[PDB]
């Protein structure tokens, strides 16, 4: 679930 | 040919990008007017599963994320599920002797999601233990929906086993986190035990044909089909018996069952054909015999044995059963709380997936827990612990029962 906040920062800040 | 992982696909994912992320590309497939897509079927892959001292499992070029000199040892396999909520019951036929499961959740549909545990509802009798939490909404509505939606999906994990691997919020059009997804399906998914030196068997599932017009008569021809191993590892060139094979019509005795075996050449393996049959996937079995019999569509549902095998096959059937007390998972408040699942009536069509073969079920006598049936064609003996009775309740099938050979 740390994977989710990893997405929440990096994925959605850079990619869709 | 290594893993028979399953997947549970409801409506409107975007399916070629996720499956082709985990299977590479589609096979050249053919001979239209196929079989209806709610029946029994299998998947495949044109990829493999590996790593490169790397969470990423790329496609077989060895540099493009970076190097890592890929292990050309095996090949990944898969089991198909197209993207509509109809794909329940044949998948639960397939959810017995497969290897693992994917678990698909969108955000395009209802966010208090109805279908997933409407889909995943044999976590007790058969095997349903290895899954992943997989969000498919990064596209339309942002962090508010996903914010409440992770509480939504963690409201699933409690006694309904929905916690096998945590959230991956993606849209597979971006192909994102497939380094992390591949790391999960390398490490966090194991490989279950097999048997090796057992005498191999197969029941035939998906036949083909290789004599299109335009060649000579001196070509090597025969019967190619599809399958997957339940026991043993099948080599090339031996006494490969099919025990009744053809429906023995006007069979007046017991020893009037015909001794028919064969040989084998092709065992298709994406680039090659390893002549010992690699299990854990679709195997491309092609027989030696040149009949009208097997190489037509005529043969689905027959055994692969040897000389002097154990099962004797006739029609004497008695089964012990029970039922399901609603249509499984379906409960819609807008006038759908009477999808009634009625008791076994006399002389009613069924689907009895004994092992992994679709033959239609006829019945003859009804008690409350056991039944004497007779079946539409001679059918081999595979297993008593599951006889997966399905039955018409709607436009397509649903599975209703569990059975026992008596």
């Amino acid at each position: 679930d740390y994977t989710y906040e990893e997405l929440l920062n990096r994925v959605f800040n850079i990619m869709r | 040919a290594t893993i028979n992982i399953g997947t549970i696909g409801h409506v409107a994912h975007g399916k070629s990008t996720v499956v082709k992320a985990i299977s590479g590309v589609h096979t050249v497939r053919f001979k239209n007017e196929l079989e209806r897509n709610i029946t029994i079927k299998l998947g495949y892959a044109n990829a493999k599963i590996y790593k490169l001292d790397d969470p990423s499992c790329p496609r077989p070029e060895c540099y493009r994320g970076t190097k890592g000199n890929f292990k050309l040892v095996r090949h990944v396999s898969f089991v198909d599920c197209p993207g509509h909520d109809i794909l329940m019951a044949t998948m639960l036929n397939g959810a017995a002797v497969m290897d693992a499961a994917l678990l698909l959740i969108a955000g395009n549909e209802s966010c208090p999601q109805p279908q997933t545990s409407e889909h995943l509802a044999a976590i007790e009798i058969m095997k349903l233990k290895h899954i992943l939490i997989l969000q498919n909404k990064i596209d339309l509505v942002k962090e508010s929906q996903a914010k409440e939606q992770y509480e939504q999906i963690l409201a699933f994990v409690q006694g309904t086993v929905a916690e096998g691997a945590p959230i991956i919020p993606i849209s597979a059009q971006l192909k994102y986190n497939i380094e992390v997804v591949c790391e999960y399906i390398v490490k966090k998914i194991p490989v279950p035990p097999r048997d090796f030196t057992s005498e191999p068997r197969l029941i035939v599932i998906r036949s083909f044909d290789v004599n299109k017009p335009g060649c000579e008569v001196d070509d090597l021809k025969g019967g190619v089909a599809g399958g997957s191993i339940l026991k043993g590892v099948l080599k090339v060139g031996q006494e490969i018996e099919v025990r009744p094979g053809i429906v023995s019509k006007d069979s007046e005795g017991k020893l009037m069952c015909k001794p028919i075996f064969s040989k084998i050449v092709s065992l298709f393996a994406e680039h090659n054909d390893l002549q010992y049959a690699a299990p854990g996937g679709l195997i491309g079995v092609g027989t030696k015999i040149d009949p009208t019999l097997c190489r037509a569509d005529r043969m689905v549902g027959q055994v692969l044995g040897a000389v002097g095998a154990l099962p004797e096959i006739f029609t004497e059937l008695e089964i012990s059963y029970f039922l399901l007390r609603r249509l499984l998972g379906v409960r819609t408040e807008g006038d759908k709380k009477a999808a009634k699942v009625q008791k076994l009536s006399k002389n009613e069509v069924l689907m009895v997936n004994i092992g992994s073969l679709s033959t239609g079920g006829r019945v003859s006598a009804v008690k409350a827990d056991l039944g004497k049936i007779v079946l539409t064609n001679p059918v081999c003996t595979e297993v008593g612990e599951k006889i997966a009775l399905s039955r018409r309740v709607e436009k397509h099938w649903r599975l209703i029962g569990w059975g026992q050979i008596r």
């Binding site: - | 939504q152 609603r326 998972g329 239609g360």
Partner: protein, 588 residues
Amino acid sequence: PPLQAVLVADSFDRRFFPISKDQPRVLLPLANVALIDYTLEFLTATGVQETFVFCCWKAAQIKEHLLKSKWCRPTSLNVVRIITSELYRSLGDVLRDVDAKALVRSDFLLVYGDVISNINITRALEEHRLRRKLEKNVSVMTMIFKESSPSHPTRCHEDNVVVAVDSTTNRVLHFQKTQGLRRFAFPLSLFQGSSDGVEVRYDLLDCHISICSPQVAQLFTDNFDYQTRDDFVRGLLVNNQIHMHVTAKEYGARVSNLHMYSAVCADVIRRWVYPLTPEANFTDSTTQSCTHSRHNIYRGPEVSLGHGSILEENVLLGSGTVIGSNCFITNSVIGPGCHIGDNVVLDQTYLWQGVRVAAGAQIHQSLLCDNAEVKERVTLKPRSVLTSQVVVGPNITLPEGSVISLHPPDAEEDEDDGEFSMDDIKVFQNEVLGTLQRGKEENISCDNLVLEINSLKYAYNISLKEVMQVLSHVVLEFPLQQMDSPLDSSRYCALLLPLLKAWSPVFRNYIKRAADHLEALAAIEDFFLEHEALGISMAKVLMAFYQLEILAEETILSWFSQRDDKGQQLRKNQQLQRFIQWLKEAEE
């Protein structure tokens, strides 16, 4: 492409009784010759060299009757494929046989042995073949089936058909039958696809004729849930579309019930089926060669007319017949050997072999059978049937219906002859309380119950702090109606203990959390605070918590110092604290 056909005998959605006992349903002599010869010379009328007739019923009979035709020998353009009575039930295992024995290449005729007609079929056969060649085998079949009115004797309500179809490219939409419906409704989703329009047509009667190329062998053996052709084509019409052709002139219909027997036996001699009209002598029966005359009568050879017997419309006699005087016979058929004596009135009698009628006897709207010494004043009325050697006497009259014979249970007759006579938890409770009792009186497993309740847990995604409440709620509202009032001790627990041995790990398989133990106990003791008049039952319920896998002593004792009123009463319950201390003395 050569042209064959299969010819089934009889679909056993049964309507013929008790005529299908000695002779079959298919050797039914309509004008003194077997109906197999009528349908077989329909199949010889259009051009088909080889056809498959299937038999199930007393192979000796149809064997012997197919030993004395003249297409016994293939001198003519037919020989007949016949087989003998293994496992045969209906058209289902017929088509499973025709793609297991695989006697089919392409485009054969599927008719029962029960249609008589005059369609020279080959026209829409080739139109269908054009539709196959041109458009990639998306069109499965074509059915040809008549144009008529909403009112006809052959369109009686058993096989009434409405279809909805376009008229340009004539592919059907709905094969909706009308056995008792009177409001009609068509699902509107398939009219926006063809916005130029679509007809509806009721001018139809199915000839039970249609062609089949063995795509339907695939769509029939794969899909076991279709057995008869009607639910088959409706299943074709819900998912491959199937086409249509409206013939204009010639017709046939399937002689299903005796209503169609009357209509067809009154139409072959009103002669709507020429070449078929029974002066032709289709058999080599010199005991059938009859002579047509004015207004459609047909005298047999050595006819021996009775004096003054006047004949008006559509009659026959046979060979060796002796008819008596004063017969006003209209729209009937008579059979051979008949010693029908004097002053016998008839009207639409369908009399068969071997009869000797006695004198002075009205017979009306009847059909009877072999060796029947029928006797004086047997006056009948519409829809009356005598059958097969049973003898009536001096006016044993019969009303409208007559299911009679010589066999005991089907008839009206014994051995001898007839001589003498917020909202989502409100809906959550209901299905839960409905599914639980279906596992108690059945001697079954218990894990299926918890999977079904977790299945029914999910279909709104209700949280745990309502679901666990409702399930422990109902599972403590067992004892209201199947255990007696009031809150007894000995037999109350003695019948609650099978209900404590059956599902004994199920909630144990459902509970794991200690804060959930606190909240579940808080909910159930709030229930027993509000329902203390049912709260007496904690006497011998607690003896199943510690021995049979539910609770322990330390949980409620940890709970004991909370706030929640009548909780000061129920925590100071007598035998509750007595079981706490008897637990501290017995095991703790």
